[PDB]
Symmetry: D2
C-alpha cells in the first residue's frame, strides 16, 4: 500500500539493498501506518518518502546456497514480523495461510522451514513493496549534499541492464547490503574456484555431467562447507569429494536454550552496553553459535556416511569422500590445458590433490559499506577511521558538519557493537520496528 | 467489547458451556465483528444478543487433570484462532507476546505447551468475554417456546440453569442454542459408587481431599491404559512418594500415540468436509481404522519415562511382584468390596482373556459425549418424524421438522459429533476453523 | 572350528538354508562345544555330523533390499549370540572389535546398524562355518529313509539338492532335518510375467540394470505401504532424480512402527513361551492386536522424510496432481497391462474401499512390488514325507521346540524335522525376525543335540 | 584372583579401588583366563596383587548419586568391552547375569542410570573381594631395600591408615599404582564452614545439615558444570519449599559436545597420538579440543532446567520473584559466616548483590595431585633435578636407574591428562588402558 516517490524528489529515507534486513524495515513501516496495528496511526494522512535500491532483478535470498533439503537455521517465530507483532499480516504463519499450506506445515512438526520456503515467504512479503523497490540498481556511492552543514545525501546507483548511473537525494540512508564473499588471499581467480555463495548457480554449469567421477574439494568447516560437502556426494554420486579444514574437527552449533538467548531481541541492549573489551570476549565465548559451526544433525549424517565407507574399506586415505583436518592450502597450480588443478596442502599446526573444482566456503566480509561511504567519511567526528553505530544503528557524525535531520544507518554489519544476531534473521522483526522509530518516529507523531 | 444482554431478554444465541469449543465461537464472532480483520465489518452497527452459561465458577480447562508437567497433546498452531486467521489477537503467539513471553517460549523449541500454560492462554482469551459469560450456571433443560402458543411453530427456546452456589434455577430465552458441554465421566458399569472411586476428571481436585497425607503409604490403583491413566499413574508416584500404585488395564500394554504426519491428516480442518460426506458405513469403518480413539493411547515420551521408572525398580529388586509400583496388564475388575469401616477397598481381578486392597481407585476410562440428549429431551419431539437421535448437518445444526420449528430458530451441537464429523470433533484440532463456520451458520444472514 | 562331515556319510543334522536362522544354530552349536562358554563341553571329544545347504552362491542377507542408507530394524544387542551369551565370540560388538571399528561404531550413538553392516557381521559369522556349508545348493525334496529293509519304520531322511550352476542332483542322508528357508515373494495374483515387474526382494539386483541411465525421466510405480515399499519409493527419488515415482497403497496412509517399550516386549525371547502356550483363538487375536510391529509399517523417521519431501513439492506447486512424486492411497491394482518390452506397462487402479469410484491409470517403465512374503515353501519340500504326519493333520504342526509332530509308529524318534522362521502362528511375530535367533539357536541345539551332548 | 598374605612382598599394590584400579583387576583376570587368550594355559602362578581403598565398600561418587542421574558415557565404554567384548566383565554380560539384558535393550539408551552403572562396577568389584583391602587410606609410600646396605631400592612399603581405628598398616610391593581420582577443588576465597559443602559430599552430607524438607531453605549452588546442574535440579525436588540460586562465572550453562568428530579425542587409540605430541601442542590441544571434562552440562538436563524456569515465568513474569534463580556472570567475593545467625551472607560481584543462604554447595571440580603428597618420601628416587612425576607412555614414572631396581616401579592412573589426554580421568579408555597396564606391569612375568 506504500505509494512511490518520484526518482528526482528529496526522499525521507533511502535503503541500500532489499534483502531481509531492508524488508523488515519496509514491513515495520507498513505496520506502523496500519491503523489496525497502531491505533495512533488513524490520524496519519502522510506517508514518508521511502525508496529501496536492490541490485538483483527480483527478491532473492542466498540463491547460491539454496541446496536441496537445506533449512533456514532459525525458528519460524523469528520471521520478519512476529516478534514485533504476531498480528502482522507479514508473519510466516499468515503467509502459509495465504498459500493454503498452514495445516500442511503444522503436520511437519518442525520449527525450521526449508530455505527454499523461507525465501518464498520473504518474496511474498516483498511483493507488497513493489512500488517502492527499484530492482536492478547497484548502489555505487553516497556523496554529501548541502542546502554550511550537510543536510542530505545523494545515492548513486548503476542500472544493471544498461549501465547508467542515476542519483537519488535523501535525508537519511540505510546500508543493508549483507556480506561479500570472503576468499583466502592465497587463492587465485579461476572458474574452477567457486565461492559457496555461487555454489548452486555456478558449479552445475562447470561440472555438467552428474555421472562423471569428478574430484571436488571443499574449503572450510562451517555450515555452508558441510552442506556443500554433503550435497556434492549426492549430486555427483561417483565424485571424489575432499573437505579441507584448518580446525581439527567439524564442531556443532550450540542449540541449548540458555546460550541461545544471545539471539533474543532484548539482548541487543545487553551486548551493546558492554565495553569493547567485554564485547570482544563475549563474541569468542559464544563462537559455538556463529556460521563457523555445523548443525549437529548434519555432522551426524556426514559422520554416518563416512562410517559406511569404513565398513567397506578400513583405510581412510582410500575413501571416496574424505575430510582432511588441520590442513592449509599453500599452492594452487591452475595454468595449462589440464582440466584439473593441483592443490598443495600442508599442516596448519605451528600432500597434493588434483581436483576439477574447489568450492570455497569461508564466509563473508561485512565492510563493503566502507567503499560506498568513502566520500562521506570526512563527516565523522575527528580522528575516527571507522564507522561507529549508535545503539539505534545510526553512525556518529560531527554535529558541526551534519544536520541533525540527516544521517546514515547501518544494518547487518554491526556484530562488533550489537552481537552475533546482527547479521542473522534473529532480531529483524524487532529491529525493523526500532529502525522505523529511530528514522520516522518524530515524522509520524503528526 | 461484546456488551452484555439482559438475562430476561430474548437472546439471539445462547451457548451451553464455556470451554474451548464455545470460547472459539466467541473468539470467531469477535473477529467477524472486527473491522480490522474483516473489511466488510465496518458497516455492522449491531452486536448480536449472545450469552454463555458455564457451570464452573471461572474459566477452567480439565482442572481435575492439571497434573504437574502435563503438556497439551496438540501443536500450539492449533490454538483457538490461528488456523482460521493468523492475524487474530486471540492467537497463542499474540497471547505470549502480550505476556512478554514470546521469545522465551521460542527458546523452548517445543510445539506442546504445558497444560498449565495452554489453560492460561484460554483463560486470557475468556476474560475478553466476561460481560457475556454467566459462570456457575449449570444448564439442566432446554424448553421449546412458542411466541404463538396457539400454533405448532416453535420459534424460541428457554434455557433453564441451576446456580451452583444458590441452587436456584434461572431461565433465559433464546431463538438459537449451542450445546458445547464436552463429555461426562464414563465409568465401568460394574463399579459401585464410593467416594474412594474417583474418575480421572476429578483427580487433582478430589483425591488430595480424600488422601491428605502426601507421605502416607497409600495403596492407590489406576484403572485404564490411555493418556490420563498414564499421567495419573506417573503423577501418583511423585505426589505420594511412599505409596504403592498399581496400573490395571485390560490391554496387554500401554500403546503410543501416533505422531506420524500422514495419519494425523485426519485431524486437518478440511477433512471434516470429506469425512462428513462419507457414508455411515464408511465413516464407521474409518473411525475403527484411521487411528486409535482420541486419548486411548499415550504420548511416547511418557510411556518411555514410566518404563524407565519401572526398569529402575528392576535394578533394585529383580522380583516384579515386590515392586512399589506395578502394571497389571490384561486384567478386568470383577468385584469391589467397599462396605465396612476399613479405609481400604478390596479389588478382585480376573484375566481379560488375585486381589488388591487399595485406599483409592482412580478410573481413567474416558468420557461419554451424549449429555445433550438429557438436556434436549423436552425438545426432541421437534425432530423430523421418527428420528430418535439428534442428527447434525455439516454445519452442526440439528435436523428439525420444518413445520414445527421456525427457520429463525434452531439448535447446534459442538464436540459430540465424532460419528458424523470425525475424530477431530472433540479435540482442540479444528476449533479455530469450526468457530468461524459456526459464526457463519448462526449469524451469517444476520451480519450481511 | 566345526569340522566337515563327508557328503555321503549319515549326518546328525542337515539344515536347509543358511540364512540368519540356520546361522544362529551353527553359532549356538559352536558355542555349546566351546569349553570357555560351557564348562561341561571340555569332556566332549566328538562333534555332531552337521551340514548346511544354501541355494545362494555365498552368504547374503536380503541383498535385493540393501538400499543406500537402509538400517537394520533391530537393536544390535539382538544379534545372533548376545542375548544367549554376551561372552560369545559371535556377538556384533566382538565383530566390530575384530574389524577394528568398535570405537567408531560407538561414536555413531545408534543401536540400529546399517543393513550393509549387519549383513557383513553375519557374513563374518558365516565364514567361520565354511567347512560345513554347501553353497549353490538348492534343496528340492526330502524323502523317507528306512535303514532296515526288514522294518517299515523311517529312521532317516535323504535330502536332494540341485546344484544351481551345474544342475546336478546330490543326495545327503541325515537323521534330522531343519528347514530354514525364509520366505518366497508374495506376488499379487493376475500379474503378467514381465521382467519390469520386480518384487522388492529383487530391487537392488534387477532394477538398476533395467533402468541403466540414472538421468532418464522414468515413470516408476511402487506397490505397498510397508517398510520396504517406503524405502524403495524414497530411494528411487534419489537414484533417478528426474523420475516420476508413484506409491500405490491399499491403506489410507503410511503407518509408523511402534517403538514403545511395553509393546515391543512381544519380541522378548522369553515371550515365546507365553505366546506358544496361548490357545489358537488367542494367538490369532494377539497377532491382530500387534499388526503395527512387523514389516507392514514404516519407521517414523522415514515417514517423516518422505512427508517432508512431499511438502517441498507442495511449496513449489499447490496442485498435488502435478507433483513429480505422488502417493495414491486407498487404491488397488485391478490389472497390469503390457505390450512387449518396447513399450510401457499400464497399471490400472481402483479404490480399495468396499464395493459401493475414482480410478486412475499409470504408464510406467517398471513396477516394484513390495508386498511381503509367503512362508510355506516347506510344504513342497516336505511333500514326499508328509504321509508320516499323525492321522488327520493336513498341516505341519511344530511343537514348542519347533520339531514337527510325526506318527510314532511310522517314524523313529531318533529322526525328525524342525521348522524355523515360518511359525508365526504358533510362536509369535518374532519368529521370522532376527529378534529371538540367538536364544532360539540355543534351544535348537538342546532340542537337536542335547541328549547326544551329555554322552 | 587369590589373596596374598598382607605381610608378603607383593608384585603389585594399587592405591584406590575405583574404576581405574578395577579395570586393571579385570584386565589381569582376563589375561589369566586361558579361554580369553591361549597363552595363559601354561601360566601356573598368579601375580601377588592387592588393592587399597579408603571407602568401606566399592562406591562410585556416592556423594553425587542424585535420583535420575545418568552415566555420561556410552555403556560400550564399560570396563572391558573396548579391550575384549568376550570378557565376562562387560556391561552387557552383567545385565545377562542379572536377568535384565532384554529389559535394558528395550530402554534404547546408551546412558545407564548412574545407580545402575555403579551396581555394574560393584558386581565386577565383588569378584575381586579377596584382594581388595577396604577401609584403608594410603598415607605414604616409602623406599624399601631387601638388603639395607644396598644402594638400590628394590621395593616400596605402602602405609595406610585404618579409617575406623586410625591404625597405620604397612605392606611391601615391587610395584605401585596410584589410582586415587581427585580431591575436592575449593575456590581459594571460601572459608571453612560445615554449611559450605563440596559436590562430592552432596548426597551424603547435605541431608544431614538440612533435615527439614519442609523448611524454605535458601540454598546456593556455585558452578556451571554437570554436577552444579544436577545439584541445582535435584535441590528443587528434594527441598520443595527451598529457594535455590545457581551462581556461575559464565554467562550461561553450556552443553556437552556429543558430536562424533569432536569426540574422537576420547578414542583409546588417540592416546598414542596425543602422548607423542610436543608439550606445546598438547597444551594447545587441551584448551582447543574440547571444553574440560564435566565443565559442561548434558543437553537434556539443560533443557529440563530451562523448562522449569519457563514454568516459573508463566506463573510470574518477575524473575526476581522466582523461587529458583540463576545468576550468571558472578563471582563470590566475601562469605560472612560468624555470629549466632544460622545463615551465611554471600557477597557477589560481576565475574567480568548479596544472598543469605542456609547452605552453599560448591560444584567446582577436583584437583588430581594427591599423588604428590603420597609419594613425597620416594621422590628422591626420581632422575636428578625433577620436581614432578613424569609418566612414560605406559604410565610408569621415570626413576633414576642407579637408585631403583628395574623390577620395581610406580605407575600413575587418572592424573595424567596433561600427557595422555582428556580421557585420562574418565571411564573412556579404562578397558584398553587396563590391558596396557597389565602388559606393562606383568608382561615379562606372564611370559616366564
Ligand atoms: C546459506 C546461508 C549462509 C549464510 N552465511 C552467513 C555467514 O557466513 N555469516 C553470517 O553472519 N550470516 C550468514 N547468513 C545469514 C544471513 O546473513 C541472513 O540470513 C540474511 O540474509 C541477512 O539479511 P541482510 O539483508 O542483512 O543480507 P542479505 O540477505 O545479504 O541481503 C543483502 C542485499 O543487499 C543487496 N546488495 C548488496 N550490495 C548492493 C549494492 N551495492 N547495491 C544494491 N544492492 C545491494 C544484495 O543483493 C542483497 O539482496 C547465511 C544465511 C544463509 C541462508
Ligand atoms: C486432561 C484431558 C483429557 C482429555 N480426554 C479426552 C477424552 O477421553 N476423549 C476425547 O475425545 N477428548 C479428550 N480431551 C480433549 C478435550 O475434549 C479437548 O481438549 C477440549 O477440552 C474440548 O473442548 P470442549 O469445549 O468441546 O469441551 P470442554 O473442554 O469439555 O468444555 C465443556 C464445558 O462445558 C461445561 N459444561 C458441561 N456441562 C454443562 C452444563 N450442563 N451446563 C453448563 N455448562 C456445562 C464444562 O464446565 C466445560 O467448561 C482431553 C483433554 C484433556 C486436557
Ligand atoms: C529388507 C528386509 C525385508 C524383510 N521383510 C520381511 C517380511 O516382509 N516379513 C517378515 O516376517 N520378515 C521380514 N524381514 C526379516 C527377515 O525375515 C529376517 O531378517 C531374516 O532374514 C530371517 O532369517 P531366516 O534365515 O529365517 O530367512 P532368510 O533370511 O530369508 O533366509 C533363508 C535362506 O534360505 C535360503 N534358501 C531358501 N530356499 C532354499 C532352498 N530350497 N535350498 C537351499 N537354500 C534355500 C535362502 O537363500 C536364504 O539364504 C525382512 C528383513 C529385511 C532385511
Ligand atoms: C558425579 C561425577 C563427577 C565427575 N567429575 C569429574 C571432573 O570434575 N573431572 C574429571 O576429569 N572427571 C570427572 N568424573 C569422571 C570420573 O573421574 C570417572 O567416572 C571415574 O570415577 C574415574 O575413576 P578413577 O578410578 O581414576 O577415580 P575415582 O572414581 O575417583 O576413584 C578413585 C578411588 O580411590 C580412592 N582413594 C582416593 N585416595 C585414596 C587413598 N589415599 N587411599 C586409598 N584409596 C583412595 C577413592 O575413594 C576412590 O574410590 C566425574 C564422575 C562422576 C560420576
Ligand atoms: Ca508429527
Ligand atoms: Ca554422539
Amino acid at each position: 500500500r506504500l505509494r512511490s516517490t518520484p526518482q528526482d524528489e528529496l526522499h525521507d529515507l533511502l535503503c541500500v539493498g532489499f534483502g531481509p534486513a531492508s524488508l523488515a524495515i519496509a514491513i515495520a513501516l507498513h505496520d506502523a501506518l496500519d491503523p489496525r496495528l497502531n491505533k495512533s496511526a488513524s490520524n496519519i494522512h502522510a506517508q514518508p518518502k521511502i525508496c529501496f535500491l536492490e541490485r538483483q532483478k527480483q527478491f532473492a535470498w542466498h540463491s547460491g546456497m539454496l541446496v536441496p533439503g537445506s533449512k533456514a537455521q532459525i525458528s519460524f517465530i523469528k520471521d520478519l514480523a512476529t516478534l514485533r507483532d504476531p498480528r502482522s499480516s507479514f508473519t510466516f504463519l499468515n503467509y502459509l495461510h495465504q498459500k493454503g499450506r498452514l495445516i500442511h506445515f503444522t503436520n511437519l512438526s518442525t520449527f525450521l522451514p526449508a530455505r527454499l520456503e523461507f525465501e518464498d515467504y520473504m518474496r511474498w512479503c516483498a511483493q507488497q513493496f513493489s512500488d517502492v523497490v527499484a530492482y536492478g540498481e547497484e548502489v555505487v556511492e553516497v556523496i554529501p549534499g548541502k542546502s554550511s552543514v550537510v543536510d542530505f545525501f545523494t545515492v548513486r546507483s548503476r542500472n544493471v541492464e544498461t549501465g547508467e548511473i542515476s542519483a537519488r537525494r535523501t535525508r537519511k540512508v540505510v546500508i543493508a547490503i549483507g556480506g561479500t564473499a570472503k576468499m583466502p588471499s592465497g587463492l587465485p581467480q579461476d572458474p574452477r574456484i567457486i565461492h559457496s555463495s555461487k555454489y548452486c548457480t555456478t558449479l552445475p554449469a562447470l561440472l555438467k555431467d552428474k555421472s562423471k567421477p569428478y574430484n571436488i574439494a571443499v574449503l572450510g568447516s562451517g555450515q555452508s562447507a558441510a552442506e556443500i560437502f554433503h550435497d556434492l556426494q549426492k549430486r555427483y554420486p561417483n565424485s571424489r569429494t575432499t573437505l579441507i579444514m584448518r580446525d581439527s574437527a567439524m564442531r556443532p552449533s550450540d542449540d541449548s536454550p540458555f546460550v541461545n538467548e544471545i539471539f533474543n531481541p532484548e539482548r541487543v541492549d545487553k551486548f551493546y552496553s558492554q565495553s569493547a573489551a567485554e564485547r570482544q570476549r563475549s563474541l569468542l565465548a559464544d563462537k559455538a553459535t556463529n556460521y563457523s559451526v555445523v548443525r549437529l544433525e548434519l555432522i551426524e549424517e556426514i559422520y554416518n556416511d563416512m562410517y559406511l565407507q569404513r565398513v567397506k574399506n578400513p583405510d581412510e586415505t582410500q575413501w571416496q569422500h574424505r575430510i582432511l583436518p588441520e590442513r592449509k592450502i599453500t599452492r594452487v597450480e591452475h595454468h595449462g590445458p589440464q582440466s584439473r588443478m593441483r592443490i598443495h596442502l600442508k599442516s596448519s599446526k605451528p600432500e597434493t590433490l588434483e581436483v576439477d573444482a574447489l568450492m570455497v566456503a569461508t564466509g563473508y566480509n561485512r565492510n563493503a559499506h566502507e567503499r560506498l561511504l568513502s566520500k562521506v567519511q570526512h563527516l565523522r567526528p575527528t580522528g575516527q577511521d571507522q564507522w561507529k553505530p549508535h545503539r539505534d544503528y545510526r553512525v556518529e557524525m560531527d554535529p558541526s558538519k551534519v544536520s541533525s535531520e540527516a544521517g546514515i544507518w547501518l544494518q547487518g554489519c554491526n556484530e562488533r557493537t550489537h552481537g552475533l544476531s546482527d547479521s542473522l534473521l534473529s532480531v529483524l522483526a524487532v529491529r525493523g520496528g526500532e529502525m522505523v522509530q529511530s528514522i520516522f518516529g518524530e515524522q509520524l507523531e503528526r
